Point group: D2
Chain length 114, copies 4
């Protein structure tokens, strides 16, 4: 039910081999590790979770943009990019979190479908 | 070699049934019709052209954003969104033109891969 | 009543010396030159027009992104960024057209205010 | 040396009355409150800090987008938008953090200048 896709606005390409960590907000308001992986050749990260595991709650998707840029020899501004949202069962069932990266900027959107 | 994908930043969804027209710049500097279609349920428009037809040159992708918004009952700012670029055989071979729409704003990127 | 601002997402800076051409759709359906200028050191282009001159119409703001990137020695994807909109059709408004540039991407937004 | 500007991509306007909280990473690795404020009618938030106070460090600028959209009666996707960056590590700089909001999307950029 959750896919992350990352694109590079400088090169006009997927952002490949970018680390992504997903956390779930715990009862005590801390961020608990939930899923992680690295984007593929298409800039996509599939298979993070299952429907059974992905219960309603607040999630954070942290994208390691800084390591991405440094690997390409580029000095970036941000430490990482964070996307924090609530999963709601009343809405559609599949979530794509997309991010478009530049050294000093990023954009993100949600594509939420059934 | 050419795909167009359109997303809606207000609803968090693909932008479905959006008209898209592609033109090629002619020798006389006019814009000649090249391909067209409507985005699918995934927000994607496939099958616009073939490798044989998609020669180097300047192309314009016009996205009918105004009709899209009006169909949803929303007053938009722009008449359309235009994306104008050069296809270059020295670069990778497959082009995805992606656009993210809001009533008063849009973003576009190119994903160019082999 | 019309201002254009351009920022550079690679440098984290204003986009300086960006050429901008504004056209207005004529009776015969052609794009008539209306005004032009260059962004300043702040990334802003002021003084394009006047409230008398900026009548109702369909306007095109062409931001010469290719020229900008090439002048920096970069080979970018797009020829330019065009922003096309109807203006002043419910009386005079002030318009800021903002753009944020990367070599293979751009975004644009409008800020529309009623004086 | 720190300014936050927020625009609304739905309305085509500044995003007014947006709450912003700035944190600085402490020695123990926690996010310490540093400053906070609200955007004005221009969408701008000035006066967060001073050059004395804005020392080197890792800063987080939290823009309370959910609160903004809810106050407008809209149900948005994100909780907030966070912008996290190292500041002043090669001496004092001025930073503008700009954001452009839609209910299911946002973008952010930095303008960094050396006075
Ligand atoms: O639609 C966007 N990216 C995108 C999102 C998905 Br889902 C895709 O399958 C592809 Br191809 C591209 C996008 C576009 C801009 Cl102009 C800014 C931000 C995003 Cl995330
Ligand atoms: O708010 C934006 N730019 C901007 C627009 C204006 Br008008 C300014 O005075 C400043 Br300072 C910045 C913007 C931000 C993103 Cl993240 C994407 C596109 C734009 Cl035009």
């Amino acid at each position: 039910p959750l896919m992350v896709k990352v694109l590079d606005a400088v090169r006009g390409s997927p952002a490949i081999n970018v680390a992504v960590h997903v956390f779930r907000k715990a009862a005590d308001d801390t961020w608990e590790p939930f899923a992680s992986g690295k984007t593929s050749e298409s800039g996509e990260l599939h298979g993070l979770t299952t429907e059974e595991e992905f219960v309603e709650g607040i999630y954070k998707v942290e994208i390691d943009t800084k390591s991405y840029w440094k690997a390409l020899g580029i000095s970036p501004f941000h430490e990482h990019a964070e996307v924090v949202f609530t999963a709601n069962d009343s809405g559609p069932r599949r979530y794509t979190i997309a991010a478009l990266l530049s050294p000093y900027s990023y954009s993100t959107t949600a594509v939420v479908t059934n």
